[PDB]
Design an enzyme around this catalytic site. Structure first.
Site, short mmCIF file in Angstrom:
data_model
loop_
_atom_site.label_atom_id
_atom_site.label_comp_id
_atom_site.label_asym_id
_atom_site.label_seq_id
_atom_site.Cartn_x
_atom_site.Cartn_y
_atom_site.Cartn_z
N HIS A 61 0.77 -1.24 0.00
CA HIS A 61 0.00 0.00 0.00
C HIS A 61 0.80 1.28 0.00
CE1 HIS A 61 -3.63 -2.29 0.48
NE2 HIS A 61 -3.18 -2.85 1.58
N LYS A 78 -5.56 -9.40 -7.38
CA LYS A 78 -6.23 -8.71 -6.28
C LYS A 78 -7.31 -7.82 -6.88
CE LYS A 78 -5.14 -6.81 -1.75
NZ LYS A 78 -5.90 -5.54 -1.77
N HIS A 124 -2.71 -2.65 8.25
CA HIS A 124 -3.88 -2.93 7.41
C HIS A 124 -4.35 -1.63 6.75
CE1 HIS A 124 -7.81 -4.56 6.23
NE2 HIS A 124 -8.37 -3.52 6.82
#
Length: 119
Positions: free
Chosen positions: A11, A38, A112
């Site tokens: 990310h 993904k 996350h």
């Protein structure tokens, strides 16, 4: 802190240029996210320092059940899978954006990214 390491791999992209379709198609392969494809994945740009600060109140607030939402806005790029097949070649539609982000933190580090806000 291997989870933070995995966060950055999934990310974080400091200095991209294009942020077009081909950008996504390339970086998703590079970051190991194409087996299977993904379905949606968002990269945050800029400095790491600002992302980490989401875990302190310096740049974050508590959010929903177990999450944190940033105070500052980030340049982001969202890669959204299209075509119908979940297996390579993975073609992606890129959407560039600029807004705050939601993450989960452990030991003061993001681990996350919540993808729902980019869907």
């Amino acid at each position: 802190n291997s989870r933070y390491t995995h966060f950055l791999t999934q990310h974080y992209d400091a200095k991209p240029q294009g942020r077009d379709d081909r950008y996504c198609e390339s970086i998703m392969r590079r970051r190991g996210l194409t087996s299977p494809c993904k379905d949606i994945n968002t990269f945050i740009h800029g400095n790491k320092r600002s992302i980490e600060a989401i875990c302190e109140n310096k740049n974050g607030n508590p959010h929903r059940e177990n999450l944190r939402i940033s105070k500052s806005s980030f340049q982001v790029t969202t890669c959204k899978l299209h075509g119908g097949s979940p297996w390579p070649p993975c073609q992606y539609r890129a959407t560039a954006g600029f807004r705050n982000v939601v993450v989960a933190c452990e030991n003061g580090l993001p681990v996350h990214l919540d993808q729902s806000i980019f869907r």
